[PDB]
Amino acid sequence: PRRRVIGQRKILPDPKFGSELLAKFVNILMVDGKKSTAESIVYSALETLAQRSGKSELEAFEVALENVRPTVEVKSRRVGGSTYQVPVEVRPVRRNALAMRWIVEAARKRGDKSMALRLANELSDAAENKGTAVKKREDVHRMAEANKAFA
Amino acid sequence: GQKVHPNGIRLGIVKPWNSTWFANTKEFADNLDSDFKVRQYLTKELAKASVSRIVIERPAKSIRVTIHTARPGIVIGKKGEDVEKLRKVVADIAGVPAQINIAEVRKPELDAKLVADSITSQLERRVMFRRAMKRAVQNAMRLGAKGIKVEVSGRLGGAEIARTEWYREGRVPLHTLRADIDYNTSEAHTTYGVIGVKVWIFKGEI
Amino acid sequence: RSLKKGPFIDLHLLKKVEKAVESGDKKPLRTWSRRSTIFPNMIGLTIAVHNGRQHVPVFVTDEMVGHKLGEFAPTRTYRGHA
Amino acid sequence: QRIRIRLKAFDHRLIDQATAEIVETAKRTGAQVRGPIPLPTRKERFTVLISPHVNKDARDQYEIRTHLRLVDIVEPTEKTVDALMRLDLAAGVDVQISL
Amino acid sequence: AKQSMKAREVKRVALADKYFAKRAELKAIISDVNAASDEDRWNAVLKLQTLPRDSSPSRQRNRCRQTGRPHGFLRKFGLSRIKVREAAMRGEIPGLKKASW
Amino acid sequence: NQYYGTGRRKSSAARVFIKPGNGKIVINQRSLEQYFGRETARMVVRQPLELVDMVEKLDLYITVKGGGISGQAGAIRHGITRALMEYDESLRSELRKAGFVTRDARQVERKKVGLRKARRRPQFSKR
RNA sequence: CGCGAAGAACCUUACCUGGUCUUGACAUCCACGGAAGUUUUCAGAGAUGAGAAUGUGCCUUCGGGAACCGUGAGACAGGUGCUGCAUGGCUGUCGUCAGCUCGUGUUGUGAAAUGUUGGGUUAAGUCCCGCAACGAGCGCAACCCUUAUCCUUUGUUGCCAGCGGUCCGGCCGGGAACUCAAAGGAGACUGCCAGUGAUAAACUGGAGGAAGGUGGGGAUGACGUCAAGUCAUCAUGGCCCUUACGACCAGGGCUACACACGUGCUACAAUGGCGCAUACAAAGAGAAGCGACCUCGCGAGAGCAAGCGGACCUCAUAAAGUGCGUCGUAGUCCGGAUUGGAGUCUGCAACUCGACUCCAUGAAGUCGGAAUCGCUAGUAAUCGUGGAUCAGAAUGCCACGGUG
Ligand SMILES: [K+]
Ligand SMILES: [K+]
Ligand SMILES: [K+]
Ligand SMILES: [K+]
Ligand SMILES: [K+]
Ligand SMILES: [K+]
Ligand SMILES: [K+]
Ligand SMILES: [K+]
Ligand SMILES: [K+]
Ligand SMILES: [Mg+2]
Ligand SMILES: [Mg+2]
Ligand SMILES: [Mg+2]
Ligand SMILES: [Mg+2]
Ligand SMILES: [Mg+2]
Ligand SMILES: [Mg+2]
Ligand SMILES: [Mg+2]
Ligand SMILES: [Mg+2]
Ligand SMILES: [Mg+2]
Ligand SMILES: [Mg+2]
Ligand SMILES: [Mg+2]
Ligand SMILES: [Mg+2]
Ligand SMILES: [Mg+2]
Ligand SMILES: [Mg+2]
Ligand SMILES: [Mg+2]
Ligand SMILES: [Mg+2]
Ligand SMILES: [Mg+2]
Ligand SMILES: [Mg+2]
User: Which GO cellular component terms, listed alphabetically, does the Swiss-Prot or TrEMBL entry include (chain D)?
Assistant: First the structure.
């Protein structure tokens, strides 16, 4: 990306709800181009949150999403052979992307039977501000305010 | 870098094929090789008759070979015993009967095959390559050619180290597919080895 | 392996072996045909089968019937590396 | 009856004019001519190594296209058959007739 | 060059249509269970061996027609890859132009 | 009268006939729910008849060929678009803004010599 | 370093052991004797050595001349023997990088410079201004192929909207609308509208449009560099062999195995494994070939046998996908290496050394150290299909579509 600056690419809403955010979620969960599998898994986990521990069925997702979204990041900048870890503000879309990626990768490394109920537990405890996605956020923060002097 | 063959890249665009028969994959290979044999003959017995192109065409079950030549009198001979003594053996080689026609090239200095043959014939007569090359270029350019370039390569003048020496004049746009490019190659077998000659002649676009 | 529709054996080996079982056992029968099935007909005779440079003698026991002759003459020499 | 004519060639202009020559010489004897129809062209591809030795990724790709034309005649008077069997076309066209 | 290899190959071709595609009856037919299930089929299996080691269609290497190269053969033209390229660029194989799709 | 439309996607081709005044979606002599088992294909086919709204205001007889599920669904969308554009002739302006009118011209890229895929390169290593 | 090799059981084959030949396996010329082919005979591993039968084409311008065989003596044949650092031809590479030069003029004693630098701009030595330069050439771009929209023509073997009939299958009558096929034509040009810009060249944005700024992909590789690669495709200067470094045959070997490296395939599972049911492709090949239906076999396959030189017939019922059931986190109903037994088929012949099937066996492996590779969109990832080579023998190579 030296010269050619890029616009954006379209994305469909979700059949069942009509969301772009959750359509992003299932693209990030999809593996190998198996979209049907990922739609099945994500619907199966999200209703499992809603009527087991939860609200109106789109709200129950965003409440777990907001508590893992980071507000500050670290990016590194070189001197002549030194690189400072400078804290930077994260842009909205990158906030959603980082949150979704951390949720998916925390759900992938659990020990329960299905992927739907793994996702279910992780989103449920992200709603309760514990687990490992939220602590991923907490320690990216920790490191960002450890280097607060290099702003 | 290596170049594309300038006649091959223009087949079907502006340059036609040298064989215009049809065949299924049953008789394709033998058609091809009997064409090779006839071409090898009509190369090697018309050696000093200045033949430039041999077009082979196969109607239903028999052949006709059109010989483009600069010196039609020797390939038509003394009242015409010689196209007889040629078709009697071409019908012998291709197994089917044969017919022979003879077309004249009227300016033998605007054909890459004849110019290459000329330069190799002079090189085998122990002539300085510079003089051959420059005479070819000036003779081709004084007859209306829009461009020409010749190139000789390999132990020029008996040197121990081979060299490639080329001479260009006019305009030879090898990257233009519209371009009327007449290209050909020849080899001179001297007492120090083989010397390769390539000739490009540009006559116009479309 | 081969089809059950006929085992294979050569002609010259077949005739050499029949005449050797009529005439009593003899010299190690020199052969090059490593591809021929061992038959019941030559239990007891010694066949020296070619292995590339030599003729290895084999004394046919009844356990060998059904195998090929070449199985009893190794073609490659090898005994350790270092 | 019906007579069926299949034309194969390596280029499309020669076979185009050959099909013309057929279908107007068929209307010249006053016959009904069904067609001409272009059947799908069959293109055979070849891929060759282009160095003399040890250069696996350097290759050339060629193709031969065979063009196929079909024409049916459905009202043959006796002067249509001979009138089609006397016709002179250049060497690139292979014709197959079917009674 | 190795002219002797070309001689071997042409001898195999000639001797092979000499015997087989004419006397395949010794294997294609007599092996049939409807032809024999006994000493006849055995006698045929042993007769198939006294025919020369050649004369099989399975011993032709199918070399090039001009240089005699074993490898890179193309059944469509009867030439090696080198010869089909050198002759295709010169414009001698009908209809064979460079493909780009 | 019939109002007709042709639509095409990756390798599929769909012809669409619309009649006034009934609610049948029938594709290849089958229901929509019998044909497309995936609700995303069902959603893509109902897209153009959601801005151009209906209850059961036109019935549509569709056939399709070639391609897979997504290709056929996109082809049917494009065909419905063209057919209803022949029907009204001035629903065009808002269909342009929905992206339903542009023929998606993304085709699968050819495999190239020396490459394992269209662009995937063999594993390189310095030595 | 899945490179020559687009396919080493024999052959290929160039290597080894042994058995053999010497004007020769391949070619021309000379002399003599036999027309060529036939189809059996015993020895030999085989190359090679030993009888019967036979033909007589052809004009004889009646000596024999033409095809094929045997023997003799020589010019000679033959060499995948060496030199790619003697060469031609062909190829890789920097690199599809934007450059590399020339004529005339001018400047400098001269090697040389200028032009080709400068201000902008572009993917581009692309274009515009300015300028001791003025012009030109090879490159860039365009012309070529393919893909994305529409129109015209033709309408089977391809198609089925409106019609009649039907055994409910476009299958019959029938239609020429539609998909499609393949010829021709149209379309995109910063063409249009705003703004910025040095009244510039061009940049941002908008409209219309199937497509917008090189629309996507390919072919196309400038002057030259690396004494780069190939004398084993071929061709070729010189050197070397000439009862052998040439030629024929059988068996073996190129498949060895303490190890090290490169490129791939299959896994370590639940986004999964197994069982049943059921959808949606594209592009190809086929006459010593593709081989349907039916019958037999658990299966690989076998028997019989139609159709097809092919928009008709066959290869050939796509798989991932969807629905239901089960397994429930285990070295497992994961993995399928290794080995034993029984077979099929191709082929003179599967020991060394083929592919596939059935029953049994069920290693390692639980996501991989230092480190390292590919990819910017129908791409990556994954899932099947086809082709060349080829009697048989792909996890390789070259192509095609699905999901994405
Ligand atoms: K084997
Ligand atoms: K060279
Ligand atoms: K100058
Ligand atoms: K040499
Ligand atoms: K071997
Ligand atoms: K592999
Ligand atoms: K590896
Ligand atoms: K197991
Ligand atoms: K094969
Ligand atoms: Mg073979
Ligand atoms: Mg793909
Ligand atoms: Mg490779
Ligand atoms: Mg410069
Ligand atoms: Mg300068
Ligand atoms: Mg320029
Ligand atoms: Mg200037
Ligand atoms: Mg029409
Ligand atoms: Mg260009
Ligand atoms: Mg070197
Ligand atoms: Mg070397
Ligand atoms: Mg060598
Ligand atoms: Mg051998
Ligand atoms: Mg090897
Ligand atoms: Mg495990
Ligand atoms: Mg890129
Ligand atoms: Mg797979
Ligand atoms: Mg494949």
Answer: cytoplasm; cytosol; cytosolic small ribosomal subunit; small ribosomal subunit; transcription elongation factor complex
Query: Could you say which residues from 9 to 48 on chain B have a Cβ atom under 8 Å away from some Cβ of chain E?
Result: 9, 11-12, 15-22, 25, 28-30, 32-33, 35-36, 39
**Would you tell me how many other CB atoms lie within 10 Å of the CB of residue B85?**
11
Same domain? For B61 and B121 the reply is: no
Contact F43 A39 (CB under 8 A): no
Residue matched to tokens 């923060």: A141
Q: Give exposure, D60-88, as e/b (b: 16+ Cβ within 10 Å).
A: bebbbbbbebebebeebeeebeebbeeee
Three-point CA angle D63, E97, B173, nearest 5°:
145
What's D56's DSSP letter? T
φ/ψ (deg, to 5) at F114: 80, -10
Map out the domains of chain F as residue ranges. Answer: 1-127
Co-location of B112 and B198 in the same domain = yes
Q: Answer yes or no: are the C-beta atoms of D25 and D18 closer than 8 Å.
A: no
How many other CB atoms sit within 10 Å of the CB of residue A87?
A: 20
Between the alpha carbon of residue F108 and those of residues B154, F84, F105, F116, F119, the distances in Å are 48, 29, 10, 15, 12
Beta-bridged to residue D68, according to DSSP, are: D8, D39
Residues of D with CB below 8 A from F114's CB?
A: 57, 59
User: Tokens 């017995």, residue?
Assistant: B45
Tokens 């409440």 locate to A63
Q: Which of B48, B73, B106 is the last residue of a domain?
A: B106
Residues B21 and B91 in one domain: yes
How many structural domains compose chain B? Answer: 2
- The CA dihedral of A55, A61, A63, A68, to the nearest 10 degrees, is 160
| CA distance, residue D32 to nearest chain B CA (Å) | 27
Which amino acid would we find at residue E69? R
- Name the residue ranges covered by the structural domains of chain A: 20-147
For residue A63, report the phi and psi dihedrals to the nearest 5 degrees: -70, -35
E touches C, CB cut-off 8 Å, minimum 3 pairs = yes
Single out the residue in B106, B138, B155 at which a domain terminates. Answer: B106
Q: Which nucleotide is nearest to F125 (CA to C1')?
A: G373
Span CA (E32) to C1' (G133), Å: 95
Domain A20-147, classified CATH 1.10.1740.10, yes or no: no
Structural domain containing residue B148? 107-206
Minimum-distance CB partner of B11 among E78, E79, E91: E91
C18 CB closer than 7 A to any strand G atom: no
Give, as one character, the DSSP assignment of residue B25: T
Q: Which domains are assigned to chain D?
A: 2-99 (3.30.70.600)
CA of F28 to C1' of G166 (A): 21
Q: Which two tokens stand for residue E93?
A: 């194989």
CA distance linking residue B55 with residue B117, whole number of Å: 19
Of D48, D50, D65, the CB nearest to E95: D65
Resolution rounded to one decimal, in angstroms: 2.4
